[model samples]
Target: MTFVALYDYESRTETDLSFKKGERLQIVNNTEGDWWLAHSLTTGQTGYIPSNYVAPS
Candidate 1:
């Protein structure tokens, strides 16, 4: 599944993903937590991102 970022989020750590608002992200892993693994189509970077930062596209 894919989602569009709701806001710009600069990664606080190396393992997190940094992205801009309206960027499309493909969900890689979505467990029962606040973070979800996603792939950024725009940057071709994959990392963990906050679930609330995105919405279904």
Candidate 2:
């Protein structure tokens, strides 16, 4: 599935960093406010981020 980042100009380079606009990610754990504990499908690491930044693909 493909997930998109909701925020504009956000950064997802940190352990708990936010995502930027159109930044697609893999949703790991789903929470409120579109919040999901996500992992870099490209990197294989995990962190907490807003699920609003992503959608089911």
Candidate 3:
């Protein structure tokens, strides 16, 4: 349920995850392989973020 952002990346086309480097968050689900459903406790923006962009926290 917990994950950590691997790098800083903005929503280039609203499809990408807008997260700051080292930002920690929890996943709502990971049924998708490339992208997972999650949100940041800091920002409160729930959306699809790349699974590879995060690591076990």
Candidate 4:
């Protein structure tokens, strides 16, 4: 349902979501092993984020 990023990420692709530490992201998809689809509540943007970068919240 929800996840919190543990650190800031710039991004390596246009599809990647750039987020700051403590930002709350809505979990859109988690089918990937290392990446999950995330929606940034602050920016209202949806993109992929590495699984390790976020923790279940």
Candidate 5:
């Protein structure tokens, strides 16, 4: 699944993703939480991004 970032972010750790508005991301794992694992299509990185910070795309 694809998603849109709700805010700008900088990877705070190895398990975090850096994303900006309109950045395309693929969902790797997500259920219902504050954070979810995703893969950045632009950066080719896999990590956890804020769930509330992104919406379905």
Candidate 6:
């Protein structure tokens, strides 16, 4: 489960909101990267996030 950088800045943990550097987010959907919305494959919901945040690994 390798996740890519969603943004250039620090990221907060989705569970506890703790901040971390060089965090990798797991992509479990079919949505493309570098966009505003990332579809959740597990929940089937669209998450709105920064467009500059992400590097598809």
Better of 2 and 5 by lDDT: 5
Candidate 4 — which pairs collide?
none
After superposing candidate 2 on the true structure, give the runs of residues whose Cα lies further than 4 Å from its correct spot. Answer: 1-34
Q: Write the per-residue lDDT of candidate 1 for residues 1-57, one digit (tens) a residue.
A: 899999999998786799999999997755544777899999999988888778899
Candidate that scores best on lDDT:
1
Residues 1-57, model 4: lDDT tens digits? 789999999988877699999999996655544777899999999977877777788
What does candidate 5's lDDT look like per residue over 1-57, in tens digits?
888888899898796689998898987755645767899999999987878778888
Q: Which stretches of candidate 5 lie over 4 Å from their true place?
A: 29-57
TM-scores of all candidate predictions against the true structure: 0.50, 0.36, 0.41, 0.48, 0.45, 0.26
**Top candidate when judged by TM-score against the true structure:** 1
lDDT (0-100) at residue 53 of candidate 6? 64
lDDT of each: 0.86, 0.71, 0.78, 0.83, 0.82, 0.57
What RMSD does model 2 have? 12.7
- Candidate 4, position 7, lDDT: 96
Indicate the residue-level lDDT of 8 in model 3: 86
lDDT for residue 3 in candidate 2, whole number 0-100: 77
Higher-scoring candidate on lDDT, 1 or 6: 1
RMSD of each candidate relative to the true structure: 13.9, 12.7, 13.7, 13.8, 13.6, 11.1
The parts of candidate 6 lying over 4 Å away from their true place are 1-35
- Indicate the residue-level lDDT of 32 in model 1: 40
| Candidate 2 global lDDT | 0.71
Candidates in descending lDDT order: 1, 4, 5, 3, 2, 6
lDDT for each residue of candidate 3 in 1-57, tens digit (9 for 90 to 100): 788998888787955469897999876655545767898998999988878778898
Superposed by TM-score, candidate 6 places the C-alpha of residue 37 at a distance from the truth, in angstroms, of 1.9
